[PDB]
Design a protein around this ligand. Sequence first.
Ligand code: BTI
Ligand code: BTI
Lengths: 177, 506, 85
Amino acid sequence: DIDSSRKAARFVRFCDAFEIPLLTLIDVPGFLPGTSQEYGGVIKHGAKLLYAYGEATVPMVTVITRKAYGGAYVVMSSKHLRADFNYAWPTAEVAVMGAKGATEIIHRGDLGDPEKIAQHTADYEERFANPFVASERGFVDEVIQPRSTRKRVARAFASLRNKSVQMPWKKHDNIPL
Amino acid sequence: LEQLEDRRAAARLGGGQKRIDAQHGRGKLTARERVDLLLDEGSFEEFDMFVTHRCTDFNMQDQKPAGDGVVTGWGTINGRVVYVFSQDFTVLGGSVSETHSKKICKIMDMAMQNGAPVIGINDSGGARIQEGVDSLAGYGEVFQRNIMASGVVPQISMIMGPCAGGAVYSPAMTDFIFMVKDSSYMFVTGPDVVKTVTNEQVSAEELGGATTHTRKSSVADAAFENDVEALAEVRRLVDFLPLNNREKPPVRPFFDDPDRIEPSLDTLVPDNPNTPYDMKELIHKLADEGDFYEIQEEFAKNIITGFIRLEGRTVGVVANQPLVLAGCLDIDSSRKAARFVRFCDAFEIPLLTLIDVPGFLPGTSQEYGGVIKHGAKLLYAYGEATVPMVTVITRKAYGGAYVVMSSKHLRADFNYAWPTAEVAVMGAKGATEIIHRGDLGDPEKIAQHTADYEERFANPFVASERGFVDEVIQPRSTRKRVARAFASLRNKSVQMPWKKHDNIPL
Amino acid sequence: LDSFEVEGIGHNLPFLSAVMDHPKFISGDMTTAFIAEEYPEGFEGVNLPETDLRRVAAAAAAMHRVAEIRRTRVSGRMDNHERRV
Ligand SMILES: *C(=O)CCCC[C@@H]1SC[C@@H]2NC(=O)N[C@@H]21
Ligand SMILES: *C(=O)CCCC[C@@H]1SC[C@@H]2NC(=O)N[C@@H]21
């Protein structure tokens, strides 16, 4: 939400400005709905955290514990923001949106049949709410056993101690305010 | 979920237990087994294990294996991070697809962002035809990466199966190419097309086998006996290399003394000038624990290129071999050393050049073959190089060759000479016939004119009066002279003029 | 003999070692045809007995580790993730 975003956004930038690596633990559903949010400017504040990870060049390791849906999924140090390690728990679910809403969009002429959509959802759920479609794509470097996280992450950072990445030259950024 | 463990173990099976046997049948280890022996025991972290291709043509989508033909990830070699990919021949022939390359690029891109070598284990049937241009593009992104990393992070290629077509061009651009004696091969065009177009009938092994390449084409750096030693020798190699172009050669303990004397050396150069000796004897005695990892041993044998350490640090070495072609420099010896020098320089590895060359190898074959260009490559290499350069002339240093062999005019640091050294424009004989024309009809004049040129110029002292040889030393002390010479150059820093890149002859 | 080191030429050091270990030499029961009787096919090489292979195995194994540990002390290794012999 606006606030959670402004809160993490700055944290990230400070850690990056100062070579401190980032560990991002994910389980986000999406953004918080509301007239309050939109009129409040989430379009801009929401972006801040996104901007932060996009800009960050310290070593970035990620572990999605459960939910990773849509835009928020991308914002949480996704692999598209160039994070280094994108780990996932088996209980992870990365997808465009929830099976339900997904279904209503993909299968319009099928709502008047509460069993079609009840089944259409039961399939999206079974086929997409997990970490494996993202695995086939490479967006999750690996799916790991929860107990080993400490071990996985620790060495992941270890191997990144030498990381060195270059952002294009510029006086400074123009991040939304 | 133990479901995870299942998926995992399912993937690990590759093209299945039946194919795994087939593979083992050819004396070839599996993709994963090769990775297993390459990286520090339990230090491998795999990436993209469940990657599946995105092909839809030719019912390709009914066969979507996990991993899609290549095993990628990272690990360590003696504790140092290394990035790797091993092609899994049992899976769709380890055929290159859009996604198979992507996997390789991921770790190439990671190797570069973190400054760590990339070991490529090629064992592929070639491109995945059904993918069409996507297979081509797949190669493209690897090539590009291969190119950008050239001289930025060491790229060791290991061929352990087939390698055909565009594919060859990748290992082509890496810093080293090792092949496994009988189970491997590589060529741009297949034996069957060589027939239908040349009417020539040749077998894959003949066309591009480990031997053909380690001694005829100039493409491989060594042919290992089998998959196991292949892997073992590669780590050995890695233990010498720096992790990237920023840091300098790695250091480690060394149970040898920088002041060791080899008196045996004092008699290595035979009295008779027509009798060879093995330049390699010297190399071993100078080398630290006598260890000398040779590169392209079986090729251009008239010259030796390899790695050794001194005081536990890596030193590259280029030296002339009297035993072959009388230590002549020739197109191939030139190409062979030239690149070695360039790789060592691009990576801050010092050079020790041991000299005893008579000149270049005469011949229509050489001239029509372009020695003018190839010959220059080595010259170009030493001219460009800025790492520390120590030289020891053991005997012959005549003319052009003399200059090319890390001469002082190429701004080498130490130009040492054994008393048996002879640096001069050309041999006493030829020299005389040019200097004294009107005297040939008097076979005693020229017999005497030569005897004087010989007595006055065939040695290292005229060059010493000039400063070209910083000093003439007692052979036994070479190890001592050279060791501290390098020690004192550890801080060397020299600047070449700014430029996007060089234009060395091709 | 075991410590006599020779390199560069072919020599009989191993052969000598062989006869020194030859029982008949040990028992002294030797004739002037000994050489001809015992080595009719030239020097067929020598091969160690279990308790010998055993001792050697252990030594090589012991030395190998020593050397292997040294490969481990390379500079530039991951701080808390070195190779463990
Ligand atoms: C039950 O599923 C009612 C719909 C709630 C949708 C949830 S609320 C926050 C999440 N982000 C979003 O935009 N919608 C998701
Ligand atoms: C003696 O037999 C005649 C001299 C032969 C010349 C030799 S052959 C290779 C050396 N390089 C060169 O150009 N001349 C030397």
